[PDB]
Amino acid sequence: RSPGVFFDSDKGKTHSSGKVLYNARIIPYRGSWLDFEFDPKDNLFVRID
């Protein structure tokens, strides 16, 4: 997988309501990853490594 930023989502399989959750992942060539994610309650969340 090439370095950069990728936008993905789960196809409602994580929540029984079938609500899709979207995330954006920044993956570098060398360093620490970064993740932005949506929760079922529509609250942006950040995640490191």
Binding site: G12, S17, G18, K19, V20
Partner: protein, 353 residues
């Protein structure tokens, strides 16, 4: 299991979900069997004589409709624009088209709502189903398409909306083994078919927080059963009539545990055998039925005591059926009164452990 009604043209439209059609020779021997889908149209009646090669029923296999029972004016109830439904407008005229959303794309405001179509009369009061005392309203599930406008006069037996259904994939052995494992693990279906727990007359009662209530009054004895059927559930029963154990209050997929509890051991073993064999018989595999019957026997090995009796078993313990039988046959020889139990159904993984 036929429950039909006559449309405007004079044909017969099925309003039941488990209609079976059979061809019977003059000797009285059945020779052909077919299943009639909900909303199908029957050219001929029931009990009539037809010729070989004569069409008797027709339907559209790609869409499942909803057919009204009483004529009148259609109106929307709990149908909120842009929040629970999505509408498009044909700007060339006054027409429009509407799509009911699913719970996956609606806000919390529409989470507790329940959109539906209500049939009223000209006077504006609620039209009731003839023969009963219930309003003529129909709930629309997700992804349903309506082609009607508010206030439109509709005739009995006409379609109010259409519900598209998915196609599927190839029907090979990689698509039935999950069903076989589902049957042998005795999993519970997502939405069961509510079955009457006890026999007798039926009557409704108090309603709370969008939930109905069903009280079955036995013809003699106690009157304990008060079942809290959800309001969104569709029923086939009305106050005043009588039902027996194992009858279908609400249609849907069955649960093997309920079949075992209500109709007995033979019913559940027959259901399991038929369901398993209908997967293998599609692929040209031939297997005798003793082999499935012994597996079902191994699944039914546990019993839960319901009363201690003269035995030493506790009140709510689960034990082997053979041990209960041995203890009871030992006690009955001494003139005492043994204990009583209830058979259990366990999955193969859980039964083995």
């Amino acid at each position: 299991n036929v429950k039909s009604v006559v449309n405007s043209s004079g044909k017969l439209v099925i309003t039941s979900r488990n209609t079976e059609l059979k061809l019977i020779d003059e000797f009285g021997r059945t020779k052909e069997s077919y299943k009639v889908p909900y909303g199908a149209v029957l050219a001929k009646g029931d009990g009539e004589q037809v010729a070989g090669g004569e069409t008797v029923a027709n339907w559209d296999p790609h869409t499942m409709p909803v057919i009204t029972e009483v004529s009148g004016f259609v109106r929307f109830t709990d149908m909120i624009d842009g929040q629970t439904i999505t509408r498009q407008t044909d700007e060339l005229t006054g027409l429009s088209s509407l799509v009911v959303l699913d719970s996956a794309e609606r806000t919390a405001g529409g989470k507790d709502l329940r959109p539906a179509l209500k049939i009223v009369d000209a006077q504006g009061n609620d039209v009731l189903i003839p023969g009963t005392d219930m309003p003529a309203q129909y709930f629309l599930p997700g992804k349903a398409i309506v082609q009607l406008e508010d206030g439109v006069q509709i005739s009995s037996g006409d379609t109010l909306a259409r519900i598209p259904q998915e196609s599927g994939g190839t029907k090979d052995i990689t698509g039935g083994l999950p069903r076989v494992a589902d049957l042998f693990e005795a999993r519970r279906p997502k939405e069961p078919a509510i079955l009457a727990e006890i026999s007798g007359i039926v009557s409704f009662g108090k309603e709370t927080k969008g939930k109905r209530r069903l009280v079955i009054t036995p013809v003699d004895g106690s009157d304990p059963y008060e079942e809290m059927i959800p309001k969104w559930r569709q029923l086939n029963v009305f106050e005043g009539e009588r039902v027996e154990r194992g009858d279908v209050i609400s249609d849907g997929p069955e649960a093997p545990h309920d079949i075992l509890r209500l109709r007995g051991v033979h019913a559940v073993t027959r259901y399991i055998v038929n369901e398993v064999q209908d997967v293998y018989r599609l692929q040209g595999v031939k297997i005798n039925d003793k082999h499935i019957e012994v597996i079902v026997r191994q699944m039914l090995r546990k019993a839960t005591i319901v009363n201690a009796g003269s035995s030493d078993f506790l009140e709510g313990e689960q034990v082997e059926y053979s041990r209960v039988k041995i203890a009871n046959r030992e006690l009955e020889a001494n003139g005492k009164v043994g204990a009583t139990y209830s058979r259990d159904l366990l999955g193969i993984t859980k039964a083995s452990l």
